Amino acid sequence: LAPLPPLPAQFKSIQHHLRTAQEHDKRDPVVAYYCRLYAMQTGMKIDSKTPECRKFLSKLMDQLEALKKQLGDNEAITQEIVGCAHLENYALKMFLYADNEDRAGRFHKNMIKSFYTASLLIDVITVFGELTDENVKHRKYARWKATYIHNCLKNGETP
């Protein structure tokens, strides 16, 4: 994949979802595709006119097209309904890993990152439509726990 230009300031709010895409370029290309799709759709709504922004989006579009071509025979790519299901099960698995660590009193970077990225993946799922009830709740909870546990650790508090 051809690298993207520097992220425009206008697109600060998709920075982290684009990192989730890169984290999955080998691990789960379906996840990587949909993280990019969310970023592209969101960016287009933010600013598709400012030259720096339009340049960035154009290149992101190139990445999406290359990935879709590479993964074309994959049902999760040809049917967004199936892609959504894939993202849902994947994000839930990650959320529950973090949840189970928390409820066992095991506080560490891996479970903080799992809560954080699970929340980003639920953001990504909005590209498909309305979040499920569980998605709304789990995302709210994951954003809370990622930051709360990080804060407890850095300051010597017991969660």
Partner: peptide, 15 residues
Amino acid sequence: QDELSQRLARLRDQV
């Protein structure tokens, strides 16, 4: 129409 919006729409077109 916009080529970017069009490419995105075409990318997401369910066939």
